[PDB]
Amino acid sequence: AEIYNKDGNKVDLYGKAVGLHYFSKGNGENSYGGNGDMTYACLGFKGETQINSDLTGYGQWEYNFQGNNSEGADAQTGNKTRLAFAGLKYADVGSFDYGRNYGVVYDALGYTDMLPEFGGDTAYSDDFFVGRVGGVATYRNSNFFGLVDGLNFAVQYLGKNERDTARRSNGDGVGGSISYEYEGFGIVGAYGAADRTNLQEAQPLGNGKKAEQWATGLKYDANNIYLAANYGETRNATPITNKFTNTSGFANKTQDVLLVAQYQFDFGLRPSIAYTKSKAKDVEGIGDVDLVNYFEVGATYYFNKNMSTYVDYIINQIDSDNKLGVGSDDTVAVGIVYQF
Amino acid sequence: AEIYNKDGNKVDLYGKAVGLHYFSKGNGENSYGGNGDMTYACLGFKGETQINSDLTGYGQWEYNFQGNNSEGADAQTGNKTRLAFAGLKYADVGSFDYGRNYGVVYDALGYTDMLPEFGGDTAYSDDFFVGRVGGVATYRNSNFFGLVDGLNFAVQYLGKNERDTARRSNGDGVGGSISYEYEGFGIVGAYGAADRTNLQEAQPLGNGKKAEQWATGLKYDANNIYLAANYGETRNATPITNKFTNTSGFANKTQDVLLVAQYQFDFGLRPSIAYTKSKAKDVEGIGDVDLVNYFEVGATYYFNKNMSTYVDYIINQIDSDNKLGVGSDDTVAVGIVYQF
Amino acid sequence: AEIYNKDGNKVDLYGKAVGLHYFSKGNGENSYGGNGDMTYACLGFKGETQINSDLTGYGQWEYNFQGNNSEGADAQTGNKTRLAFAGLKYADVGSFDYGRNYGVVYDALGYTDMLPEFGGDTAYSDDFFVGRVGGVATYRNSNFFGLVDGLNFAVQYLGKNERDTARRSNGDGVGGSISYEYEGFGIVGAYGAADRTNLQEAQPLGNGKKAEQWATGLKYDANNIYLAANYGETRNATPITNKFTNTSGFANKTQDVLLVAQYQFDFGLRPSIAYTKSKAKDVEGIGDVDLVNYFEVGATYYFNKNMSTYVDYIINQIDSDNKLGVGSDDTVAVGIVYQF
């Protein structure tokens, strides 16, 4: 909600309270999304100041406050800053920002990341260019310097992040994307390669000294209709765990397909139908193994722009003999969202 | 403070900075409330949107930021989300919300939870239905569907929370309350029973497979006067620790009495007089032992609706030979509160 | 940004998103400021209510959210509340506040704590009276009860803080300051002494039962010019670590000199030139050792009051044979700040 707007500076303080619950049989250990209370709340700000007609400054921070922990020792579990960056937009020359932000490949994956509660399986956090990462410098151009409406691109420099954990670490890398949007249609191609840290390489699964990720996306967004499609691949980038051996590392290779179709009724109901499949190839010891494989049926009802509720049902297609131990049970999310 | 209110959506951003200090002899280890700096600050939001004339959506999140930690490793100690839920209110049909909220028995205990700094001893957190818990679905009706002014009730479903700690865990349960308020008078009855988790049962103290809690309250609230009274009981629900053996678990049984009398002078001074006693029965090994037992004399002065100060003095009646090791020294809290 | 102002109560919600990066050779282990992403964001509030013409209440809380952590286990690293206090200002009698705030000696050190990114080396946190500490009661008088324009003083009572760490602990103490400001000129003297805790005394380095710190400052602040100077000394107060032996404690004695000169161009550019040197004396085992020693060249450009960028370059004068192991490499900070 725009809580401030004077002297060319407007601040938007936003946030949401999400009452959420997951339903899965058993202890949800073998299910797709887990089982039980998953309530949480978000709080963040979006600032934008007009330094003059062509130059705009801006900044954004967003935090995740878990609402399913006790007030005891476990109180902070799951709490984190999602975004934190600042930047400048200049006329038609483009924009540049730095800090914790979305990797460029997400410019692709963003297409299908539209399910009510699940979806966007391949958009992992602190995983190179697919989701939110720290230390990214990002340049973005819109409409090819104003010369070609609908043609956009971005380049992104990822700075090395040596964390205590191989899963949350990364070496330096570069990534870019090109997308074109013409009247309800949109197409994108995104790609990024990077160095893997010593620790990442010291992991049991996966083998290489470079990490790659590219995805393409197609979408039809108009007339209350939303059909989007994604296909991407990766090398030594996708994090995987062998639940049996308790071994971890990255998939040597994965081929990812995400499909989504939705419709927005004028009365507030937005039904959703999706399909996701991500399969690892050449996993040391296992061979080819599905990481994600399901159908999704769900719906969101919007009371207005501030209130809504939804049910997200995952019809898991992963089978019980999945070599890595990926769960095979279904998961049903019900939630009630307030937001400003 | 209502920082936003447009298009039927109003957001209230609130918070307080509390300079606080406890005075107790010794290392406050044997005193009632501890000794030293207890400064803290709170920040939260309360949103409410009018979906139309009969339907209202809403949400609330509230966080506790300890202000007595260093900027070192201990910086996060005591930090937590107190509330986090969303819900809908429909005409005279009632309201329903879900997320982290107050257990139904607190509908009773809330009566005497009015001391300047202490009080509400029996309203523990993550303790079934007495204080704030996670995963509660709560339905509340006011004025019996609009048919009977002053008659209100609530039912509440508690979802199982299996935490690493027996103290912060719980099984599924149900609770409800009925209260009636007629011209300054108010009466309530609250009750809830629930399953105890494996771990809770694996504890040394307490013995059962179900946890119960009920409290009743009477109050006179009018003409600058506030006299409230509470009496409740519990079975295998109250958490207790034997400081000697370092053993823990829950009291098999407790009988709780809380008394409060206060007066609001027109010039801002609100003196307070209270009495609290909670006694455990059949504690394995000890027998009958007082958990809480004191008198309270204190005062709050309100400069205005945003500023105030207070002194809360606990005249501890617990004696030095208390079998569990509950402290016997007095505690005096002084604080200065700014709030918006 | 003043987001609220009604009925004599105004709240100012402020914050900033800082994209920041450090450049140092090697693993920045031997450099002055480290190497890599140092992005972060701040959020805090400042409230002030007019209880009447002479009496003002107020409160302030400020939090630091690190933006260079992953969304994993390390997510909370570096997060902390910087300030948290409440107080009252009465006519010309002065003000008094309590909670986490700035120690009185900082009334001196504040003079030179003006570098774009570095500087204020001696203003440590949770280090008695030099930086932010918890549990400080502070009385401040301005203009000597209104009788002498420009004459100000403060007294401060520090309450004992026994933390798990000797570095973050403190015993009771008292401190005061006197400063005088006449037309662009300002002079200050600050001093404080305190008890050292058992644990602090149990440390290998440093020897005493009392901790002292005093600093004086001179400054010329006018006509776009800023020249400030600080000289202070300490006894058993400055925390020091022997990187070789991995030993820690406090310097028996230190002599600190901080120098700063800056100029604000009308077009937004504020160049900066500074010099800092802090040298420990009588360090058990080493003798005299420099703790900090460098020159600083840097610049800040202000697009407007909400946006800016800067480069801070540290020309480290510490030499590679520094007995304690203090790093000798240079560090260059580049950052882009959005703030409201």
Cα–Cα distance measured from residue A34 to residue A271, given in angstroms and rounded to the nearest whole number: 23
φ, ψ of residue B60 in degrees (nearest 5): -155, 140
Resolution of this structure in Å: 2.7
Cβ–Cβ contact C340 with A under 8 A: yes
Chain C contact partners (≥3 CB pairs within 8 A) = A, B
Q: Which residues of C touch B64 (CB under 8 A)?
A: none
Sign of CA dihedral B226, B231, B235, B241: positive
Cβ B85–A39 below 8 Å, yes or no? yes
Q: Which residue in C11, C61, C168 is closest to B70 by CB distance? A: C168
Is-contact B82 B237, C-beta < 8 A?
A: no
Instruction: For the beta carbon of residue B295, count every other beta carbon within 10 angstroms.
Output: 15
Cβ–Cβ contact B15 with A under 8 A: no
Is-contact A119 A260, C-beta < 8 A?
A: yes
Is-contact A149 A177, C-beta < 8 A?
A: no
Cβ–Cβ contact A310 with B under 8 A: no
Chain B contact partners (≥3 CB pairs within 8 A) = A, C
Cα–Cα distance measured from residue C144 to residue A52, given in angstroms and rounded to the nearest whole number: 45
Instruction: For the beta carbon of residue B183, count every other beta carbon within 10 angstroms.
Output: 8
Q: Which domain holds residue A236?
A: 1-340
User: Terminus-to-terminus CA distance in chain A, angstroms?
Assistant: 6
**Residues 136-175, chain B: which have Cβ within 8 Å of A?**
159-161, 163-165, 167-168
Cβ B134–A65 below 8 Å, yes or no? no
Cβ A67–B61 below 8 Å, yes or no? yes
Cα–Cα distance measured from residue B81 to residue A338, given in angstroms and rounded to the nearest whole number: 17
Q: Which residues of A touch B135 (CB under 8 A)?
A: 21, 36-37, 39, 68
What are B21's two structure tokens? 């200090």
Is-contact B276 B292, C-beta < 8 A?
A: yes
Q: Which residues of C touch B74 (CB under 8 A)?
A: 163-165, 168
Is-contact B233 B214, C-beta < 8 A?
A: yes
Residue whose entry in the numeric block shows the structure tokens 């037992």: B293
φ, ψ of residue A200 in degrees (nearest 5): -60, -45
What are A93's two structure tokens? 């020359």
State the DSSP string of A66-102: ESSS-SSTTTTTT-EEEEEEEEEEETTTEEEEEEEEE
What are C50's two structure tokens? 């007019």
Cβ B8–A304 below 8 Å, yes or no? yes
What are A110's two structure tokens? 């963003």
Residue whose entry in the numeric block shows the structure tokens 């005075």: B23
Cβ–Cβ contact C9 with B under 8 A: yes
Question: Where would I find the beta strands (DSSP E) of A132-172?
Answer: 132-142, 151-158
State the DSSP string of C120-168: -TT--SSSTTSSEEEEEEEEEEETTTTTSTTEEEEEEEE--B--SSGGG
Is-contact A39 B134, C-beta < 8 A?
A: yes
Nearest-neighbour CA in chain A from B277: distance (Å): 24
Q: Which helix (H) or strand (E) holds C198?
A: helix C198-201
Residue whose entry in the numeric block shows the structure tokens 């280890």: B29
Is-contact B121 B292, C-beta < 8 A?
A: yes
Q: Which residue in C72, C306, C338 is closest to A126 by CB distance? A: C72
Nearest-neighbour CA in chain C from A102: distance (Å): 13
Q: Classify burial at B327, counting beta carbons within 10 Å of its beta carbon; exposed 0-12, middle 13-18, buried 19 or more.
A: buried
Instruction: For the beta carbon of residue A91, count every other beta carbon within 10 angstroms.
Output: 11
Residue B37 carries which side chain, given as an amino acid letter?
A: D
Cα–Cα distance measured from residue C340 to residue C337, given in angstroms and rounded to the nearest whole number: 10
Among C136, C112, C105, which Cα is nearest to C211's? C105
Cα–Cα distance measured from residue B211 to residue B172, given in angstroms and rounded to the nearest whole number: 10
What three-state secondary structure class fits A28?
coil
Instruction: For the beta carbon of residue A267, count every other beta carbon within 10 angstroms.
Output: 7
Q: Which residues of A touch B132 (CB under 8 A)?
A: 71
Give me the half-sphere count of Cα atoms (radius 13 Å) on the Cβ side of residue A241: 7
Residue A104 carries which side chain, given as an amino acid letter?
A: V
Cβ B65–C87 below 8 Å, yes or no? no
Q: Which DSSP letter does residue B168 get?
A: G
Give me the half-sphere count of Cα atoms (radius 13 Å) on the Cβ side of residue B98: 20
Cβ B85–A19 below 8 Å, yes or no? yes
Q: Which residue in A65, A303, A305 is closest to B63 by CB distance? A: A65
| CA nearest to A338 within chain B | B59
Number of domains, chain B: 1
Is-contact A228 A145, C-beta < 8 A?
A: no
Q: Classify burial at B211, counting beta carbons within 10 Å of its beta carbon; exposed 0-12, middle 13-18, buried 19 or more.
A: buried
Q: Which residue in A49, A59, A168 is closest to C70 by CB distance? A: A168
Which experimental technique did the depositors report for determining this structure?
Answer: X-ray
| CA nearest to C27 within chain A | A162
Q: Which helix (H) or strand (E) holds B198?
A: helix B198-201
Cα–Cα distance measured from residue B241 to residue B246, given in angstroms and rounded to the nearest whole number: 7
Residue whose entry in the numeric block shows the structure tokens 């000794």: B35
Cα–Cα distance measured from residue B214 to residue B217, given in angstroms and rounded to the nearest whole number: 10
Q: What is the CA radius of gyration of chain C?
A: 21
C60: domain CATH number is 2.40.160.10
**Residues 273-302, chain B: which have Cβ within 8 Å of A?**
none
Residue C232 carries which side chain, given as an amino acid letter?
A: G
Cβ B67–C4 below 8 Å, yes or no? no
Query: Cβ neighbours of residue A311 under 8 Å, at least 6 residues apart?
Result: A116, A298, A299, A332, A333, A334
| The Cα angle at residue C17 between residues C13 and C22, in degrees rounded to 5 | 145
Q: Which residues of C touch A51 (CB under 8 A)?
A: 303-304, 307
What are B280's two structure tokens? 């455990």
Cα–Cα distance measured from residue A191 to residue A250, given in angstroms and rounded to the nearest whole number: 18
| CA nearest to B43 within chain A | A43
Residue whose entry in the numeric block shows the structure tokens 């769900």: A298
Q: Which residue in B6, B58, B61 is closest to A65 by CB distance? A: B61
Query: Cβ neighbours of residue A319 under 8 Å, at least 6 residues apart?
Result: A328
Cβ–Cβ contact B45 with A under 8 A: yes
Q: Which residue in A3, A76, A307 is closest to B76 by CB distance? A: A76
Cα–Cα distance measured from residue B2 to residue B14, given in angstroms and rounded to the nearest whole number: 8
Pairing state between β B173-182 and B239-242 = unpaired
| The Cα angle at residue A178 between residues A177 and A182, in degrees rounded to 5 | 145
Cβ C61–B39 below 8 Å, yes or no? no
Cβ C98–B70 below 8 Å, yes or no? no
**Residues 52-81, chain A: which have Cβ within 8 Å of B?**
65-76
Q: Which residues of A touch C340 (CB under 8 A)?
A: 4, 9, 11, 45, 47
Cα–Cα distance measured from residue B249 to residue B242, given in angstroms and rounded to the nearest whole number: 9
Q: Which residue in C13, C17, C305 is closest to A86 by CB distance? A: C17
Q: Which residues of C touch A6 (CB under 8 A)?
A: 1
Residue whose entry in the numeric block shows the structure tokens 């004599």: C8
Is-contact C332 C9, C-beta < 8 A?
A: no
Query: Cβ neighbours of residue A62 under 8 Å, at least 6 residues apart?
Result: A42, A43, A44, A45, A81, A82, A83, A84
Is-contact C61 C81, C-beta < 8 A?
A: yes
